[PDB]
Amino acid sequence: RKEPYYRAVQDEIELYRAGYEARIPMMLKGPTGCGKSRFVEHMAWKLNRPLITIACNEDMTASDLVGRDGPLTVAARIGAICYLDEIVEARQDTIVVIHPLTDHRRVLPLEKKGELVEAHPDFQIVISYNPDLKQSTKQRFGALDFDYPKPDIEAEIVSHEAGVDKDTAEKLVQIAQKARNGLSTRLLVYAGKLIAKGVDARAACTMTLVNPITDDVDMRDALDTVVKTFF
Amino acid sequence: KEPYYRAVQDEIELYRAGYEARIPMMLKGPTGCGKSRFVEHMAWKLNRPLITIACNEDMTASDLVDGPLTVAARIGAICYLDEIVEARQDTIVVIHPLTDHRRVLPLEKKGELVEAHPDFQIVISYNDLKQSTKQRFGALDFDYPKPDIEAEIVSHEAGVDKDTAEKLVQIAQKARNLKGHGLDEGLSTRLLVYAGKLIAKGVDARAACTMTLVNPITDDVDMRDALDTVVKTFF
Amino acid sequence: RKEPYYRAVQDEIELYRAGYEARIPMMLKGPTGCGKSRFVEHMAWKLNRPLITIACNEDMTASDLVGRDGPLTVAARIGAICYLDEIVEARQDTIVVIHPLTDHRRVLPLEKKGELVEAHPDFQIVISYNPDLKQSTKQRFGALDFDYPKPDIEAEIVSHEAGVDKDTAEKLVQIAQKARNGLSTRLLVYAGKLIAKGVDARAACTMTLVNPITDDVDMRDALDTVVKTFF
Amino acid sequence: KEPYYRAVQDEIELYRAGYEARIPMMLKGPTGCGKSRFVEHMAWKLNRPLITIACNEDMTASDLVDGPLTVAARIGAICYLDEIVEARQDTIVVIHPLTDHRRVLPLEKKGELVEAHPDFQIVISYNDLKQSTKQRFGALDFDYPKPDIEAEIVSHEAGVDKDTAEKLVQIAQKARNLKGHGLDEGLSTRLLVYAGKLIAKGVDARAACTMTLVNPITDDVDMRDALDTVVKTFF
Amino acid sequence: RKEPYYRAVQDEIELYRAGYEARIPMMLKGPTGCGKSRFVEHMAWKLNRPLITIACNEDMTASDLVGRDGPLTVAARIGAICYLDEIVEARQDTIVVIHPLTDHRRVLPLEKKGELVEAHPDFQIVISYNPDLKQSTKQRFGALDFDYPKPDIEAEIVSHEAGVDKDTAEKLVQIAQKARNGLSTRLLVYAGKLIAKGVDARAACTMTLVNPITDDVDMRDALDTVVKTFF
Amino acid sequence: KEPYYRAVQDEIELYRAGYEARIPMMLKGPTGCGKSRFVEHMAWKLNRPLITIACNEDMTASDLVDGPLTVAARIGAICYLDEIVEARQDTIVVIHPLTDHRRVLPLEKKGELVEAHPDFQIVISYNDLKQSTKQRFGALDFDYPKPDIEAEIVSHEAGVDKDTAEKLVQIAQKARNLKGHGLDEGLSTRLLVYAGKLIAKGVDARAACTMTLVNPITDDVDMRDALDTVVKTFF
Ligand SMILES: Nc1ncnc2c1ncn2[C@@H]1O[C@H](COP(=O)(O)OP(=O)(O)O)[C@@H](O)[C@H]1O
Ligand SMILES: Nc1ncnc2c1ncn2[C@@H]1O[C@H](COP(=O)(O)OP(=O)(O)O)[C@@H](O)[C@H]1O
Ligand SMILES: Nc1ncnc2c1ncn2[C@@H]1O[C@H](COP(=O)(O)OP(=O)(O)O)[C@@H](O)[C@H]1O
Ligand SMILES: Nc1ncnc2c1ncn2[C@@H]1O[C@H](COP(=O)(O)OP(=O)(O)O)[C@@H](O)[C@H]1O
Ligand SMILES: Nc1ncnc2c1ncn2[C@@H]1O[C@H](COP(=O)(O)OP(=O)(O)O)[C@@H](O)[C@H]1O
Ligand SMILES: Nc1ncnc2c1ncn2[C@@H]1O[C@H](COP(=O)(O)OP(=O)(O)O)[C@@H](O)[C@H]1O
């Protein structure tokens, strides 16, 4: 596995490491595209552990999770980090399935199969939360508070991923900063990456910063005035 | 193999560089405005295979995931998923790991994980979707072409002379003017095409416009005659 | 196939013929029992083409349409006219299935089977619409505006189908005309057909014109006053 | 084989000619008023086989379509579909091509199309249905028979003397008077039957009427004693 | 089969016996735990007849009832008493399935199997109703009006089932009587049975009379004042 | 094999006699207050096998009914069904004949009826359920233990000294005070445990309390700093 590029905003990586070894289930909280998913993949490799990602949604059922085997069960048998992305989207009654894996009992009853699986001692559930869950689900997790990084830091992230000089990346950040009166950092990476293809700066921002997020016209010409301030 | 497409703006070059960065694109705009044909033109201009998916609700994970979306990932082909919003959401999130820096779709159950070809790109069409999904895309905004260009397209697609096409656009122009004033959506370019070809076959122009431009988009009688008023002035 | 009796009210039959040969999908719009279904069957035989009828409803799914093969697919392979009656009743997300058959692309992706079918060059979709659909579905169709025919004409239709003299048929029409302050022409055919069995004229109308349509009592004795005007 | 039926109106002759024209009939009216028994009497009087279908929601297309509805089409038998409104709607529309001038049900999947026998007729029962379906039927309106006739039926069905039957109808009469004033629906003839036969077996008439005429139709206590007041006057 | 202990409150047992032999379907109406289910089992054995109980619920379907064979069908073939407990809870469209068994026609169409079953001449449907059904379902049944028995009688029932002296049972009844400003008689049996285990009288009532029924705090200290009146 | 449990009240003796009468018990109270561990302690103290069921919605009749609930009936073991309300209702009513005087579960389809062992007991957990089901149970009301006892539990479970545990409880005390004033539910004992063990591993106590006591239960910022104020006073 190649190492995923994650730039630490604060002390979130040792808090996770501490939390991981300490048996406790982790919850990541923040807006869209603030590096939550990437953080997991960075910790998954840094701790030298397998990674299984689950894109949760409103139509996902329990048997999609445990099997008919399923991702959650596989993640339980082999020592893997099970990342339930977008936990809010999923039906909240399909998530109580993970409850036998989150407290001191660490097993998964596949009562359709008549089997009680072992939880590989190196197993942990991490979930993504933006920005509702049950209290019997919330209060079984430790929580990290993620957010869009400091302007200097985000500018470093954009330049590294999109492939543009600092001066352009700072402008993308300053535009984005005022744009969130959330707006994914990935959209800034897209914008810069387009500029790295000889695309008009405003057009690059129009494609990524004003069009994918809102279909309100007078919205756009409020964000396309702030793009014209810097670019 | 160039499919007929007339650019209204910088969409051809913007999508070009948009593909050069392998960025997931979203085509936004009204129905029948050239979105589905724009992809074909770019798939030809960028010189690469194209796989089209018509998204409905009875489209499970399996059929999207031997799977067409999986095929475009192997070959390195532009994957155009038309009308994504209609598809149930356990599909919309299937494309999520293909929108990451990873470039990878998980062929679970069946076996291995699939790392996509460097020439692969995912394209969707859009007028719901979550902000988690919308912000994974770059976006181009399509609207009905200006009278000059639109008439050229109609004339070419309908097989009618320039004069007839201009009048058809003129009718469509007077009808798009009425959105929020009686129409849920202005007149499509597709219906403009539909009209000229009835005319190109000898059908009375007033009748041809009635069954393609007036009737399909309106049930209200007093504003349907308003469109009929327009037709009787240009034809 | 025996020819279905269709009496032309105006220029709807050459407009369909013109529209058919011209690749465009047709939509029939009008009240219940104004001869929409019959018109299709008349055009189906007159153009010497196979006919597949689909009774759309709120519980009909896409796999009921394309197959698990289905009617729509069969209609696509062999050169047939696929008539989707009562298109408003069906779930509007199950109808976007026909979209790949209605524009210039003319195919049907059976992604459950891994097959892309050819559209037999003599294939067309016609739908029944009373009196909502998506704009992405509406604006792919040409539309004919059907309605209950002129009094003289409907009287001819009733006499031909029910089997009664003109004088009785005119009365059924005049009653119906004022009854629609819709009311199917078929109910008039039923009424006359009962009169052709030695049934009291008012009783024949009571069974067909006032009872099947409304369960409001004071409604009935408003329609049973107009039946007593003519009969 | 004549099943016991007493005509309240011209329903027997109206249905007779209604069948002679092979017209789809609908029986409208309250529950337990003789609708399901009227069909049997006519199926006997018109001298023809009869197939009855009890429509619920777990009645797919297959079970209606070797299928009973298909059987009546082959043989030429009156097909009585009881409580149509309860059935899911992909069934209600199965009968549509059998209500046309065609007289034909499509046995799709399995094979051929099925042209029905000239002696076939479809009958439904009704107190929802679309106007597209309701206007495919002729309709007869059933209501509870007038005191003279109703008592004769009760006496015959219950096996009680004329005097007892009249009082039971009298109780039912005073209860149908209260609809919109405390009762969702008046007292059925079926419950009137139920009462006499408890009485025909030696059960105290006040108790017999209580568990058949009062209790099954009312939960409200102060109007339940209102019905109990009626019972204690005739019994 | 051992005889179930049922104490007759009034003339409900001969009315059932009379109703049973007289072909008519029976309905039991009353609050929770007033001896409705027990009454059926008492009549089932006293009439020397097999008994099949069905716990109706909002997710129960028709095929759960008739088979895929099912309980209702089995109860129809062999001469058994089919007891549909909690009929209000079930989907009311899944219960019209029993309609062909409740009138003079006594059959069950398994149209999925292509079979019309005989109704064993000794077959009857009894249902539990607390305290809505369709009129086409209601008016096919005879109805018995059950209720919590007279204080003297209920005290006899508690002493017999729980195993406590009269004086304790009367107190449980008097507490319960005022508690229903329903409250199951079974909760009184539980309370006394706990007292028969050396449990504090108020604690025994707290576990059964104030805690299982309400989660309102100021409710509890209104019922725990009346428990302190007698105990 | 005694699992660590500290009694807050008479729950151990009340459940003891509650089992001696073979009465179905319900454990009521907030999440993470020791309900699931109380059963284990009693299953050990009463000297008998224990089968635990985690109830979700995709738990049909079959998996509850070779079935664990059936197993506890044969063996004579306490059957703890955790979070019953989450389970679909055709399961909640499966336990109904096991709550009667009969003591019997019907293994239908598969065959015979199953009479349970005299040592069998059914236990559920609860904070919906019908009154028909709730009144089939005896009930014990659990709440978070008083500061003395709670700190002892935290200290034991967290592996921290008495002083640290008391402060953690103090923080939890100041947070349970805020329910109805900004919090949907007070701080669990489980999160109190979670905090001490980060501290028992060298994590900064202010950070440890932040990610276990503050962050998991609050999204509102101005009252999240209110909890942060509390943390900065005790740590
Ligand atoms: N430390 C970081 N903070 C913020 N964004 C980052 C960081 N490191 C990488 N990114 C970029 O953010 C983009 C989106 O992050 P993502 O994993 O989608 O966040 P989320 O899971 O919260 O949506 C990635 O493409 C990545 O390049
Ligand atoms: N450059 C163009 N701009 C607009 N419309 C065009 C252009 N070229 C062709 N068309 C016509 O406009 C119609 C647009 O419909 P299509 O692109 O197939 O679906 P949609 O636009 O809804 O994705 C086509 O029928 C086509 O004949
Ligand atoms: N030209 C016509 N106009 C109106 N009604 C007609 C015509 N020709 C036949 N009919 C009669 O109308 C009846 C109902 O027509 P139908 O096909 O049900 O219309 P729809 O499909 O709009 O409900 C048929 O039984 C037919 O006999
Ligand atoms: N001519 C009649 N009119 C009214 N009721 C009758 C007549 N003949 C018999 N009955 C009795 O009335 C009851 C009507 O119920 P039934 O006809 O079976 O169901 P429904 O009337 O709801 O279709 C029957 O139980 C029958 O005993
Ligand atoms: N005659 C009676 N009246 C009231 N309760 C009784 C009677 N006989 C027994 N019981 C007790 O009532 C308890 C609950 O009765 P149950 O069958 O649950 O009533 P329901 O079916 O109305 O809920 C039983 O445990 C039984 O011991
Ligand atoms: N006697 C006790 N009272 C309260 N909490 C306890 C006790 N003993 C242990 N605990 C701790 O409290 C937590 C309670 O969670 P648990 O009992 O497993 O779930 P729940 O209480 O939600 O059923 C456990 O993690 C356990 O470490």
Author numbering:
A (entry chain A), C (entry chain A), E (entry chain A): 11 to 78, 90 to 152, 160 to 209, 218 to 267
B (entry chain B), D (entry chain B), F (entry chain B): 12 to 76, 90 to 151, 160 to 267
Task: Give verbatim lines from the article.
Another member of the expanded α-carboxysome locus is CbbQ, a member of the AAA+ superfamily proteins (ATPases Associated with diverse cellular Activities), which are found across all kingdoms of life and fulfill a variety of functions, mostly involved in ATP-driven dissociation, unfolding and remodeling of macromolecules. Here we report the characterization of the CbbQ ortholog that is associated with the α-carboxysome locus of H. nea (Hneap_0905). Our results implicate CsoCbbQ as a component of the assembled carboxysome, where it is tightly associated with the shell.
Hexa-histidine-tagged H. nea CsoCbbQ (Hneap_0905) was purified by affinity chromatography and crystallized with ATP in the mother liquor by vapor diffusion in sitting drops. Native data diffracting to 2.8 Å and belonging to space group H3 were collected. One molecule of ADP is bound to each monomer, indicating that the ATP is hydrolyzed during crystallization. The C-terminal domain (residues 176–270), the CbbQ-specific portion of the primary structure, forms a five-helix bundle that extends from the NTPase domain. Within the hexameric assembly, the majority of the CbbQ-specific domain is found on one surface of the hexamer, as a result this face of the hexamer is concave. The pronounced hexagonal profile of CsoCbbQ is distinct from that of other structurally characterized AAA+ family members, which typically display a star-shaped outline31. This hexagonal profile of CsoCbbQ is a result of the gaps in the hexamer formed by the NTPase domain being filled by the five-helix bundles of each protomer.
